[PDB]
Amino acid sequence: TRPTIRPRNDVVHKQLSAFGQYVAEILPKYVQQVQVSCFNELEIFIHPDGVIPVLTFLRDHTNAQFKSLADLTAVDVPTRQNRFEIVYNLLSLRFNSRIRVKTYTDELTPIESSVTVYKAANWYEREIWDMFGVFFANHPDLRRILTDYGFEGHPFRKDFPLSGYVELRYDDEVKRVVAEPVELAQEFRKFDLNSPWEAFPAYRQPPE
Amino acid sequence: ILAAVSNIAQNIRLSSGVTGDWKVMNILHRIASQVAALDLGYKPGVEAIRKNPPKVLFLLGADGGCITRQDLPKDCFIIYQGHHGDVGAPMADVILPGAAYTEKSATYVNTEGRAQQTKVAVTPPGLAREDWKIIRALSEIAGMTLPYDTLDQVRSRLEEVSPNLVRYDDVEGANYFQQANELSKLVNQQLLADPLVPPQLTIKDFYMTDSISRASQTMAKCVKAVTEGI
Amino acid sequence: GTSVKPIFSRDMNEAKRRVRELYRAWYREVPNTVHLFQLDISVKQGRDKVREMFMKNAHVTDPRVVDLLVIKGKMELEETINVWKQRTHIMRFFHETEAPRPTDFLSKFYVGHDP
Amino acid sequence: LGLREIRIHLCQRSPGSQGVRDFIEKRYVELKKANPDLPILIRECSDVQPKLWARYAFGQEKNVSLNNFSADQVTRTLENVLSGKA
Amino acid sequence: GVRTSPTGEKVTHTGQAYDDGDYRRVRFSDRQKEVNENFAIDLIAEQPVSEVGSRVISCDGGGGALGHPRVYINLDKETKTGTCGYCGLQFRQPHH
Amino acid sequence: QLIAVDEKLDITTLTGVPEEHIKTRKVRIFVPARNNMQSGVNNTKKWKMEFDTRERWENPLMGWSSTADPLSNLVLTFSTKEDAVAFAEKNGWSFDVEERKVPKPKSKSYGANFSWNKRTRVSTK
Amino acid sequence: LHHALIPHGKGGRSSVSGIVATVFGATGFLGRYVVNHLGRMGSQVIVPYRCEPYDTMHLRPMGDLGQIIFMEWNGKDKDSIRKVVEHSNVVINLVGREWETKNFDFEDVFVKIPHAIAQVSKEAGVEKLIHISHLNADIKSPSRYLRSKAVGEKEVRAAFPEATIIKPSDIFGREDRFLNYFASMRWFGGVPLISLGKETVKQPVYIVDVSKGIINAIKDPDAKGKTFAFVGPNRYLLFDLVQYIFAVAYRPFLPYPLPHFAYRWVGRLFEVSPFEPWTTRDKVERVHMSDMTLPHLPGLEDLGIQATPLELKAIEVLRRHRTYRWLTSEMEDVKPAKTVNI
Lengths: 208, 230, 115, 86, 96, 125, 342
Ligand SMILES: NC(=O)C1=CN([C@@H]2O[C@H](COP(=O)(O)OP(=O)(O)OC[C@H]3O[C@@H](n4cnc5c(N)ncnc54)[C@H](OP(=O)(O)O)[C@@H]3O)[C@@H](O)[C@H]2O)C=CC1
Ligand SMILES: [Zn+2]
Description:
This is part of a larger assembly, with 7 protein chains of 7 kinds.
Chain A: H1 10-26, E1 31-36, E2 42-46, H2 51-60, E3 68-76, E4 84-92, E5 97-105, E6 111-112, H3 121-132, E7 136-137, E8 166-171, E9 176-181
Parallel strand pairs in A: 2-5, 6-7
Antiparallel strand pairs in A: 1-2, 3-4, 4-5, 8-9
Chain C: H1 12-37, H2 43-55, H3 63-81, H4 87-91, H5 105-111
Helix pairs in contact in C: 1-2, 1-3
Chain D: E1 3-11, H1 18-26, H2 28-34, E2 40-45, E3 51-56, E4 61-65, H3 71-82
The structure holds NADPH dihydro-nicotinamide-adenine-dinucleotide phosphate and zinc ion.
Zinc ion binds near residues 59, 61, 84 and 87 of chain E.
Keywords (chain C): Electron transport, Membrane, Mitochondrion, Mitochondrion inner membrane, Respiratory chain, Transport, Ubiquinone
Membrane topology (chain C): Peripheral membrane protein
Protein name (chain C): NADH dehydrogenase [ubiquinone] 1 alpha subcomplex subunit 6
């Protein structure tokens, strides 16, 4: 257990659990769940309507003052009714801590923009709009950031194909770069890698 | 023989009574396409062709050699549509390449009466096409075009002809044994004094049965192994 | 009820007026686009293309989907006006290198293995 | 011009097919005795509706709804179809 | 041992050559076809069979960790030699 | 502040998928069968959505397998059957659903190998 | 069908169309479009070239990997012709030159080379042969170019009975010598037109139409021994055509009549250059001659092609000849010229 196993820190575990207690107590209206992982990471699951309040609290409260927004991303889970899971990672330099706030949405429900709370979100939300198609309400300028001009679709969705639907080549007849339906000389080879025996009994699910 | 077996089943039913839903009578088929063809109203056997020889003959994958050109008049237009060159291909005037069971999403009916559908794993080689698509294209070319254009539409028509062909895992059926038993008593054809011998006498007759089996080198190896041990 | 949240419009009337204003803007912008990008198409051709693009989504009855389509159309128009798009991006709407794929049964039967 | 096949799709446990079922269990055999060479295909139905299909020369085909028909109505419909009617 | 087809094209160790009816030959016009002349099937046949006085021998291909995984080959069969599944080396026992 | 939309959810216009890949495609929703080369059953837990196989030809150069179907490698994983059905419905795809197959419970007995009169007794062990 | 040449795919760049084509004269105006159209389908294209390989690099991106194969050849050496057509099922001939060099004459490029190509193709078993002639090819024509074209047409037909012969007329396009030729005469101030260009009628055809017609003739099974005439949809007088050309390019049109003998002398003067001549006496004769009318021959409509009128594609050719002030003018601004049809 000593050499090849990652050591556990329980002091940070208790501190993060107590702060989850504190945050869940102050904001019962929006906080839906608080979790602490075994590698000492604190997550708060909130109702979407509380994106602006909770974040503001975490930025402005004296005991929290999470004054840095490290990252803002989304995860696509097609099996959920609310498809997209929005993740905010915040850093507190005053207390040398990190926190995670997660909410959810679907293809048609917008989310309040947090640019007022964090100026850094301006581009991040654009990427979430570009890659996942999640609309953010009250954004100073929401447009595509990463894909090509006029690119149809949101590639980071699970149902979007790996190679897309169109490809570009230069045509001499029209004397310009044109887009055509994608064709591949060699098809991407799909590998079925998952083993038919479970690896981790701790994560076993109810027998359905 | 069918009348005798139905009589045995009738005796069993009228002696033991109606035990419930047991369905004593059973017919064991050996052809994948037989039950579907019977469900669609085809005439079993080739008696009609011998009785009234046609001028145009459509061989839809028929390789049993039951009908040859000696059984047909001259200038007979034989059309073969299939996937292997076998008994029925060299006698054809036009050959239409079709798809095999691994190359189409097609419906086959079990000996139980259970309908199932295959899935496309590969695509037909060369210029080979799906069989119903070939027939539909031919109908359009002749001007007497068919009212269905996709696979779902032809399966809707299939449901119209026989609705049980679109229930893809249900084996439940209705027993009408007594009606068929009553109808079997009208004719009284006499049995033949010939012993019942199956065509499948030994293991060596099992490997090559259809066109795909005959074209397989593994089955030829198996036959050569069972004929001489070595 | 379905308990759904709006983006901009409450019903289909607000969505339709937004669609109409976006169509007005595109109709106004087409000649300027033709002059700036030095396109070899006519203004009438470009307006037909705009009309066809709008009519492709004429079947939508959800105000939320209509609002999102209008938002995407505004982004496309902003890219076109600011000349962020190049001539290639504008001309991709016309598909001048793609041979016409036939639709009837016999042509599909003659060409390939798929419907 | 003439009759080539008859198809009765009856829904096995649906109440609306009850009368049709009665016909099959009573007066089908006699009918098949009157028409030794007429295909009369008795087929299983979904949860939808009982129907009767009549096919004529050159692939003409028309159907009649048999929902809630009594056995007498079913045999009258067969008598009409078999005769030069409908 | 590389041979030549009646077309005049060198036949690879996999035994493939473009047919006389194959247009793909044009890619070799004014150019050459890359063929390796060291056929492994011919080179391994020239190796003498090794006679060892044990029922089970071990083969690692030679070189230790620079060979293949070490395997054990049984030599009870007398009408056939024991072949390594990795290297193709043959082993037998003193006979006659 | 709600609008209470009525009709069926449809996001086909917002996905960027070409029309020919919506109206002509057929998806299969199923639980994959256990690989009979193994006894583990961990791959028979989740539901899967895949698409119908399209044409694959061979490259004139090097003889590789070329395709033109962009959805030939797309497989989606779902918890329940109705989740997959809802996803397919809202994405505008026609679907075929195969109901889950489970091996029925079997009555095993080691003593049956040594029956006094039944046929169950084993010739060798 | 030597199954490696059965169509497979969606007709894309990576697809296989069953076409193996040897395109003689593929480094020219029509050749680049023909090769591009062949490579779009996924065809195996053989490009015989005699020029510097650099001058062929614009043909590199027109096909998938290995689909375009370049080989050297000589017009006078039949061994190279055999070497480049050994494995092709289609041979397209586009070899021609508007002027005579010291090494090749009109008979060399329009009679000898086409006949050698046809004979070698017939010997090698090529199934389809497409040969390009001129609409105005006549044995008794006043120009050597068209007399050679007619003689070559006869000889190709004799050597390859099942050849498809295509006769276009004054192809216009980005790299043409028809619109660019008239536009470049602005450098001399005035435009010399014999009889003010009022005695000549032209029916020019678009380059993409010709390329599509060649492709469709390749894929047409019943176009074996037929002869086609590819013409545009409108006929114009030379004066009206040049006036429209100068109106599209927004250049001052100052036409003057020049006698036939003097303008022939001008062509003789320009012939002397060792480079590509600006004009020649043969160009003089071909420009001032009316396009023939051949109502007995099939045209582009028989191949499923609808001819593209000059008024929709002139701007893409003549915008390069504009000054900065008129460079952004639209296509709807020129009020198309008068057409003398029927
Ligand atoms: N107005 C028009 O354009 C229409 C064209 N004509 C015919 O259409 C054909 C092609 O037209 P186009 O592309 O415009 O002509 P180009 O001059 O642009 O090119 C002709 C091709 O033929 C090759 N070629 C020319 N001379 C020789 C030679 N002595 N030996 C070998 N190869 C040679 C050239 O190769 P390289 O570049 O290396 O020299 C070149 O690739 C020609 O046969 C022409 O006669 C038909 C009606 C009119
Ligand atoms: Zn070894």
